[PDB]
């Protein structure tokens, strides 16, 4: 087998909004992970269930590449056992997570002059998400007793709101691109190897 196509995930031109995060399982390939965990051009590199230097002597069945864009303040929430509007309503990691979280500042790519309104997040949900669930629905959230009948109004809000990503934003408010690698093993033979 030849390279795992991790480049086309890290180096994609368009990243997804956190509410509608993208995924791509990797299979039947080999990859050197030092090229990432020694990059230093990633502002964030945290692995939870595994040594990043042990990936080379470890094989797995699948590797999942979840990518999205959140706010700099919220990179804290992309971790096991975290709360907040991102970890509750947009992207949730299991407590028994085995993988690595990789993030970097994209203010120079995703911040626009009058604000970039393409990047959205979910501000309202009735139930907190389950691990690795994705809700892309646009249902008018009921914030009261009076139903909404599919119409936005009083206590009837559109559940998605936008990061107004501007290049003059504070660093905690700047856009950060995220790639979440999830290493999985089951009875299916391991095909993706370090």
């Amino acid at each position: 087998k030849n390279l795992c196509p991790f480049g086309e995930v890290f180096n994609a031109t368009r990243f997804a909004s956190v509410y509608a995060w993208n995924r791509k399982r990797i299979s039947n390939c080999v990859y050197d992970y030092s090229v990432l965990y020694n990059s230093a051009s990633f502002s964030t590199f945290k692995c939870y269930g595994v040594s990043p230097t042990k990936l080379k002597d470890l094989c797995f069945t699948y590797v999942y590449a979840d990518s999205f864009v959140i706010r700099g303040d919220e990179v804290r929430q992309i971790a096991p056992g975290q709360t907040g509007k991102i970890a509750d309503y947009n992207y949730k990691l299991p407590d028994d997570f085995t993988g690595c979280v990789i993030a970097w500042n994209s203010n120079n790519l995703d911040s626009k002059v009058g604000g970039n309104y393409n990047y959205l997040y979910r501000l309202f949900r009735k139930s907190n998400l389950k691990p690795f669930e994705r809700d892309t629905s646009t249902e008018i959230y009921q914030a009261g007793s009076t139903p909404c009948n599919g119409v936005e109004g009083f206590n009837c809000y559109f559940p998605l709101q936008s990061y107004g990503f501007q290049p003059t934003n504070g660093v905690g408010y700047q856009p950060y691109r995220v790639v979440v690698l999830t290493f999985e093993l089951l009875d299916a033979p391991p095909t993706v190897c370090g």
Partner: antibody, heavy 127, light 111 residues
Framework: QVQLQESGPGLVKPSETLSLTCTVS?????????WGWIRQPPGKGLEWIGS???????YYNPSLKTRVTISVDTSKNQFSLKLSSVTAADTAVYYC????????????????????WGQGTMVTVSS | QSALTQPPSASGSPGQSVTISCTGT?????????VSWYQQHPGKAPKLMIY???KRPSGVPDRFSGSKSGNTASLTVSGLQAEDEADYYC??????????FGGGTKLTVLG
């Protein structure tokens, strides 16, 4: 400092295609918002023609969908209006405008309220 | 004629309160809370005064207010000033018909 400016011929021979272009400055159309065209015949009311955002999706006035095309040129930051088979009833002041809402996926997006307007160019349909 | 009824003319006095009505159907003004109000002075572009039924853009004086009741929406202008004499249009989303406009109301200050 979002600004919109209309350009195009002030005269169009009947049954031929009207063509207008709206140049946007101070804000990239790719960044967000819906961009629409509204016309007004002399001494009459406002008629919304259609709206568009940077992907190319469009919503049109039902009384004009067979003759209206709205395009967008993001690399050159403008969006255009083509209206074919014109008559005297198409003689109007044509405005280009920007929607109030920057989010593109809101309900009725591009068919709600319009926030910044151009000064409006007038097209006369005559031989 | 137009998709939304709007009285052709409304006559208020200086400093008083004038209200313009806009009557649609259940498929437009009754159906949704996306009613917009525009001011147009002779020879200049329309100006947004009220959006989303009651919201007011910045700079618009708080003299101008909008509300909705059933299939009828209304814009109210209190403290009528001299430069309030203009044309006024209501707007609404109508589902299949998308954005539809009222015919417009002429407002003249009686002084």
């Amino acid at each position: 400092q979002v600004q919109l400016q209309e350009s195009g011929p002030g005269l169009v021979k009947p049954s031929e295609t009207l063509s207008l272009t709206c140049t946007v400055s101070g804000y990239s159309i790719s960044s967000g918002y819906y961009w629409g065209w509204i016309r007004q015949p002399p001494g009459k009311g406002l008629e919304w023609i259609g709206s568009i955002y940077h992907s190319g999706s469009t919503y049109y006035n039902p009384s004009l969908k067979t003759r209206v095309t709205i395009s967008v040129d993001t690399s050159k930051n403008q969006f255009s209006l083509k209206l074919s088979s014109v008559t005297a009833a198409d003689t109007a002041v044509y405005y280009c405008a920007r929607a109030v809402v920057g989010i593109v996926v809101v309900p009725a997006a591009g068919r709600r309220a319009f926030d910044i307007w151009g000064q409006g160019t007038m097209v006369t349909v005559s031989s | 004629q137009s998709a939304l009824t709007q009285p052709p003319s409304a006559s208020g006095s200086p400093g008083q309160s004038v209200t313009i009505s806009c009557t649609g159907t259940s498929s437009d003004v009754g159906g949704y809370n996306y009613v917009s109000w525009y001011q147009q002075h002779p020879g200049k572009a329309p100006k947004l005064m009220i959006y989303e039924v009651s919201k007011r853009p910045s700079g618009v004086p708080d003299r101008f207010s909008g509300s909705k009741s059933g299939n009828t929406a209304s814009l109210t202008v209190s403290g009528l000033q001299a430069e309030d004499e203009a044309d006024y249009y209501c707007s609404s989303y109508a589902g299949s018909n998308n954005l539809v406009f009222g015919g417009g109301t002429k407002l003249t200050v009686l002084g």
